[PDB]
Design a protein around this ligand. Structure first.
Ligand SMILES: Nc1ncnc2c1ncn2[C@@H]1O[C@H](COP(=O)(O)OP(=O)(O)OP(=O)(O)O)[C@@H](O)[C@H]1O
Ligand SMILES: Nc1ncnc2c1ncn2[C@@H]1O[C@H](COP(=O)(O)OP(=O)(O)OP(=O)(O)O)[C@@H](O)[C@H]1O
Ligand SMILES: [Mg+2]
Ligand SMILES: [Mg+2]
Lengths: 604, 615
C-alpha cells in the first residue's frame, strides 16, 4: 500500500527551558514508487524528518514504519540492513571520508553489503562517470570542489541500488547543467521503480517531482500531487540473519596507513611502555649482580672447627663445602740480614687456605699440593710482613730463617709478622707432633647458613662467621624491593601512556563510524576493523619493543664497564602482554560506544 | 579606478601526473564598489579565484593587487590586516568553529580587530537578527540546520564591516525567502559603498549584480555590465596587554571545550614527573640502606705499625679527619681460673677508644674507662669467645683471672667480628712486660675524607713532629672501597633509570600533545582567514600549554609527595628519600617539552596558507 507510514511523529531537542519542539505531530504517508519533493524555510524540520525516515535518528514519540514494519521495534542489525539496501542517503553536508578516494568513498557502502572488490570499483567508477566525475575518481574529498564532493555523495547513495533514495538538497552546490543531469538520473530511477524523497529549495528541481510537501515550523502545510500514482507490490525484503573479516582487515590496514602520525605515535607509545619496563628490570638485575658481588668479595663465610687430615679430607668432598684448610701455628723468631724479628708468626695452613679466606694472589704463587705433601720449607708472605722485611725489593726466591731453619719465599697475598707455610712443614720441621690446631671450611654461597652449622655437627660425628652471608641476603631483599617497585612504576607509567594516545586517536574518528553506520555497516563490522586496527598496531609495536630494548642492551653492555644489563624473559612477557592487553582494550572500548550511537549523534 | 587588479594569474595543484591546471592566464580588473556575480560549471576554478582575492591562497604565477598594492609582496601581518578589515569572506562550506555558539562565532573576527567584548556580542546578536537567527544565538553549529549555519557564516563575514565582501555561494542552502533577505542585505551594503563579488549558480541571485562573469575550465568566458559603475573614492589604508588578556580567555574556553584532550595531556605530564621523582627517591633510599649495611660490617683504620710516643697518638686524635685513636701493645702468656690453666693466651694492651676504632660494641658491663688507663688498672674486658669458654654460661662480671701470676678483675665483654683479652696499655707496660715503648698506633679514618689522601696526610702530619720511623703505615680500607665501589654502581643505576623514565614520560607528553594540537590545525586556518595575526595564534596556544602544564606540574610534585608518604608508612626497610634537584629537573623538563610541542605545531599551522590549513 504505502511504503512509509508516519503517524503522530514528534521530535524534541534540548533540556528545557533549552528544549525546542522541532517536529510537531506530523502524520505523513508516502506512496510506494512516488517522486516526492519536500520544501520549507531554513530550519523548519526537513532534515530532521529525513533522518528519522532513513533510520539515522529516532523520533521522540509516534510511529514510523518502513514497509509497514515499525522501525523502533526492529533490531540493530535489521536497521543496518535497511540503511544498506532500501535507503540510499544523500547527506546535506556531504559526509565523505576524507582519507578515501572518490571511488573508494562511493564503493564503501557495498563492502558491508558484501560484493567482490573488483565489481565495486568498476561500478563506483561508472556512477562517477554518470555524474561527471570519471575524471576525478582518484581525488580525495579535499581535492575536489563542493559541487564535486556533492556528486560523490550522490554516487554513494546509488551504489547499493537502494529502493528508496533520500536526497537532502542534492543539487545545492550544483550548476544548472550538473544539477539537471542529476535530476535526469533520479528521474530514470523513479522510472525503474525507485522511490524518491527529496528536500530542495530550487523550484525547477521540485518540478521533476509529482508530489510537493511544504514544511514550516515543524508542521506540514502543503500537499500536492500532479497525477495519481502507479501501484507497486513491495520488493521481497532485505534481511540477513569469514570474507567479512578479510575485508575488515584490508580496511584496518588502509586506515592505519592513512593516519601515519596517529598510528606511528600510538605504536611508539607501546614501544616505550615495553623497553622502559624491560630496561629497568635488566639494569636493576645487573647492578644487583655487581653489588652483591662487591659484598661477597669483602671476605668469606667460614666455619672454624681428634681432628686429623682424613677428617678435613672427607669434609672437602661435599657440594655444600667448596674448600677446606687444616690449621696449626707457631710462635718463634725470624732472621734476615742482621735484624732478628722476635715473636713472629708462622701459620701452618692448607692447600686451599687462600681460597677459604679469600686472600688473593699478589706476587709469585701460593702453596701447591707438592709443597704440603713434601713438607716443603716455603713460605707465602703477608702484604705487610712482605714490605717490612724486604723494604721495597722483590722478595721472590730470597730466604728467611724461622727458628734457625731456612724458608724459601714463594709469594705474597693480601690481608683481612704473619707467615704462611704448609701444615706438614710446621708439624715436621718446626713443632713436631701429629695433632693439628683446627679445621676451617668455606660454606657454599647457596646453602643455608644455620643448616650447615647442624649439617657439619652431624657429618663429622659420623664456630662459624657469616656476616657477609647475612648482608648478602639482607641487600638482596632491598634490591628486590627497589627493582620490584620501580618496575611497577615504569609499567603503570607506560600503560597510561598507551591509554591516553589510544583513547585520543580513536575517539577522534567517531564521525567516521557515524558515516559507516549510516551507509549500511552493522555494529559488528565496526568492532572487526577496530580490533584489527589495534592488535595489528599493538603487535607491531610490541615486536619493535622487544627488539629495541635488545639493541639498547647491546649498546649499554658495549660502552658500560661497571656492570652489565642482564635481561629477564619474564619482564619481556609481562611488559608485552600488558601493553597490548591495555592498548587493545582502549582501542575497542571507544569505537564500540560510537558504533552504538544513533548515526546522526555520532555525526556530531 | 580599480580595487582589484589580477593579470596573467595562473594556478596549479598537484604533482604531474597528479597535477592540474586550474586557473589559466585569467586577467580580471574589478572596479571599486561594483556588484559582481561569478558563475560557471562545478569545479571550474571559481572558489580558487575567490581564495586568491581574499588572500587565503596565493597564485602560482601572475599579479594580484588589492588597492593597487601587490599581495605577495605584503607582509604576513599586513595580510592578516586585510583579512580582518578589507575582506569579509562567506565560505562555501561554512567553516564555523564547533565549540563556539552562533554569537561567539560571529564576533570572533572582532577579537583580532580588537573591539570590546560587550559591544561584540550585541552587534553579533544584531547581525543574527538581520539574518533571522536571533532565536538561535546560543546554538552551536551542530545544533543548527545547514541553512542556519550558512547564515551564521554570512553574519560573521559582515562583523568587521569589510569593504569587500567575498561571497562563495552564500544562498546555496537557503530557501528563496531567507535567500532574498540575504540578497537584500548585500544589496544595501553595495548602496553604502561596499564592493561585492559573489559566486552563485542561481540566476535570480545573479541578476541582483550589475556585472556577471562566467568561468569555464579555469578561463573567463563572459563579462557583462548592465550600467557603468559609480565613480570611486579610495578608502584609507588599514595596516598586547589586552590582546593577551583576550588570548587567555580563548585558551581557557578552548581547554574547557576539549575536556578529554586536556585531562589526558595534563595526566600525561603528571606521570612524567611522579615517575622520574619516585625512582630517584626509591633509588636513593635503597642506596642509603645498602651503603649502611656495608659500613656496618667493619670500620676503616690505619695502624702505624721504636720511637712512638703517647703524645703522638694524643695529637693524632686532635683532627677532624681522624675520629678515634688507640695506643697498642700485646703480651703472650698464661692465664688461670679454677684449676684449669689456659696456655698461650693473649692480653692486648689497648687504648681508651679502641672499641670505637674497631667498631666493637658493648655486650655487658663496661669498657676501659679513662681512670683505668691513667692508673694502670688491672682490669680486663673479655672477648665474646674467651668469655663463654672460661665462664661456661655464668656471669663473669667482677670475678678474677690470673695472667702471669698477676690478678685481673673482669669488667665487661665485647663484640668480636687462642684467647683474646683487652687491658689498658699502661697496665701491660707496667705490670706485665715493662718498657716504655709501645707496639703501634691505630687511628679510625673518618667516613667522608678520602682514603689515599689521609695515607699521605698522616705521613705529613706526624713527620712534622719528628718521630719517624716507624710510620710504616698499613691501611685497612676495603669497606671504604666497597662503598665507593657500589655508590658508583648505585649512581649508574639511579642515573640511567632516571634517564629512561624521564625520556619515557617526555615522549608520553609529546604524543598526547603533538596529536591534540594538530587535531585543531583547521581551527587555526579559520582564525587566520577570519582576521587573526600569526602572533595571535601562538599567544593562546602557549597559554593553553603553560596553563595546562603548570597545573599538571603542581598535580605532579604533590602526587609524588603522597606516594612517598604511603611508601614510607607501609614499608619498613629503606625509606623513600626525595631529591629537590629531581623535582626541579622533572618539572622544568616535562613542561619545557609539553610547551615546545604545544607551540611547534600551532606555529607551523598558523604560517600555512589558510586554505591549506582548512584541509
Ligand atoms: N588539492 C587539489 N589537488 C588537485 N586538484 C584540485 C585540488 N583542489 C581542487 N582541485 C581541482 O581544481 C578545481 C578547483 O575547483 P574550485 O575549488 O574552484 O571549485 P568551484 O569551481 O567553486 O566548483 P563548485 O561550483 O562545485 O564549488 C576543481 O576542478 C578541483 O577538482
Ligand atoms: N542538536 C540540536 N539541539 C537543539 N536544536 C536543534 C539541534 N539540531 C537541530 N536543531 C533545530 O531543529 C530545527 C531542525 O533543523 P533541520 O536540520 O531539520 O533544518 P532543515 O529543515 O534541514 O533546514 P535547512 O533547509 O536549513 O537544512 C532547526 O530549527 C534547528 O535549529
Ligand atoms: Mg537540511
Ligand atoms: Mg565553490
Amino acid at each position: 500500500m504505502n511504503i512509509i507510514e508516519i503517524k503522530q511523529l514528534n521530535r524534541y531537542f534540548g533540556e528545557g527551558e533549552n528544549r525546542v519542539h522541532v517536529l510537531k505531530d506530523i502524520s505523513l504517508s508516502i506512496e510506494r514508487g512516488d517522486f516526492v519533493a519536500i520544501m520549507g524555510q531554513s530550519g523548519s524540520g526537513k532534515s530532521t524528518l529525513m533522518n528519522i525516515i532513513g533510520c539515522l535518528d529516532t523520533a521522540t514519540g509516534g510511529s514510523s514504519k518502513i514497509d509497514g514494519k515499525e522501525t523502533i521495534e526492529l533490531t540493530n542489525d535489521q536497521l543496518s540492513d535497511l540503511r544498506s539496501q532500501k535507503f540510499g542517503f544523500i547527506f546535506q553536508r556531504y559526509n565523505l571520508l576524507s582519507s578515501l578516494t572518490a571511488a573508494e568513498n562511493v564503493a564503501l557502502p557495498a563492502i558491508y553489503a558484501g560484493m567482490p572488490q573488483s565489481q565495486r570499483l568498476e561500478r563506483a567508477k561508472q556512477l562517477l562517470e554518470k555524474l561527471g566525475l570519471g575524471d576525478k575518481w582518484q581525488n580525495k574529498p579535499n581535492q575536489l570542489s563542493g559541487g564535486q564532493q556533492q556528486r560523490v555523495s550522490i554516487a554513494r547513495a546509488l551504489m547499493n541500488g537502494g529502493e528508496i533514495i533520500l536526497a537532502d538538497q542534492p543539487t545545492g552546490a550544483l550548476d544548472s547543467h550538473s544539477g539537471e543531469n542529476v535530476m535526469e538520473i533520479l528521474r530514470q530511477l523513479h522510472e525503474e521503480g525507485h522511490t524518491i524523497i527529496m528536500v530542495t529549495h530550487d523550484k525547477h528541481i521540485a518540478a521533476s517531482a509529482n508530489r510537493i510537501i511544504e514544511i514550516k515550523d515543524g508542521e506540514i502545510i502543503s500537499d500536492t500531487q500532479k497525477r495519481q500514482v502507479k501501484s507497486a507490490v513491495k520488493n521481497p525484503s532485505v534481511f540477513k540473519g569469514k570474507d567479512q573479516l578479510m575485508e575488515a582487515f584490508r580496511m584496518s590496514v588502509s586506515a592505519i596507513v592513512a593516519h601515519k602520525m596517529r598510528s606511528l605515535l600510538t605504536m611508539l607509545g607501546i614501544i616505550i611502555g615495553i623497553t622502559s619496563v624491560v630496561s629497568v628490570v635488566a639494569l636493576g638485575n645487573g647492578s644487583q649482580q655487581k653489588i652483591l658481588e662487591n659484598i661477597r668479595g669483602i671476605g668469606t663465610n667460614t666455619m672454624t672447627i681428634n681432628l686429623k687430615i682424613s677428617d678435613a679430607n672427607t669434609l672437602s668432598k661435599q657440594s655444600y663445602i667448596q674448600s677446606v684448610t687444616p690449621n696449626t701455628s707457631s710462635s718463634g723468631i725470624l732472621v734476615v740480614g742482621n735484624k732478628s724479628f722476635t715473636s713472629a708468626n708462622l701459620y701452618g695452613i692448607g692447600e686451599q687456605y687462600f681460597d677459604v679466606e679469600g686472600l688473593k694472589l699478589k706476587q709469585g704463587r701460593l702453596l701447591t699440593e707438592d709443597d704440603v705433601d713434601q713438607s716443603n720449607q716455603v713460605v707465602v708472605l703477608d702484604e705487610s710482613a712482605k714490605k717490612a722485611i724486604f723494604a721495597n725489593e722483590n722478595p721472590l726466591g730470597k730466604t728467611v730463617i724461622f727458628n734457625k731453619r731456612p724458608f724459601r719465599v714463594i709469594g705474597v697475598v693480601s690481608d683481612q709478622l704473619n707467615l704462611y707455610s704448609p701444615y706438614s712443614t710446621v708439624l715436621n720441621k718446626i713443632t713436631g707432633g701429629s695433632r693439628i690446631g683446627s679445621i676451617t671450611v668455606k660454606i657454599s654461597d647457596d646453602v643455608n647458613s644455620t643448616v650447615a652449622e647442624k649439617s657439619l655437627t652431624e657429618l663429622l660425628k659420623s664456630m662459624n662467621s657469616d656476616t657477609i652471608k647475612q648482608t648478602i641476603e639482607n641487600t638482596t631483599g632491598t634490591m628486590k624491593l627497589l627493582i620490584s617497585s620501580i618496575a611497577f612504576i615504569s609499567l603503570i607509567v607506560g600503560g597510561i601512556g598507551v591509554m591516553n594516545i589510544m583513547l585520543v586517536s580513536v575517539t577522534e574518528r567517531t564521525k567516521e563510524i557515524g558515516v559507516r553506520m549510516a551507509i549500511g555497516a552493522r555494529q559488528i563490522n565496526i568492532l572487526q576493523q577496530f580490533l584489527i586496527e589495534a592488535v595489528l598496531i599493538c603487535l607491531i609495536g610490541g615486536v619493535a619493543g622487544i627488539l629495541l630494548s635488545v639493541l639498547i642492551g647491546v649498546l649499554f653492555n658495549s660502552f658500560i664497564t661497571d656492570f652489565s644489563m642482564d635481561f629477564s624473559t619474564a619482564s619481556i612477557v609481562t611488559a608485552v602482554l600488558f601493553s597490548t592487553l591495555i592498548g587493545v582494550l582502549f582501542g575497542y572500548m571507544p569505537a564500540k560506544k560510537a558504533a552504538e550511537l544513533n548515526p546522526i549523534t555520532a555525526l556530531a
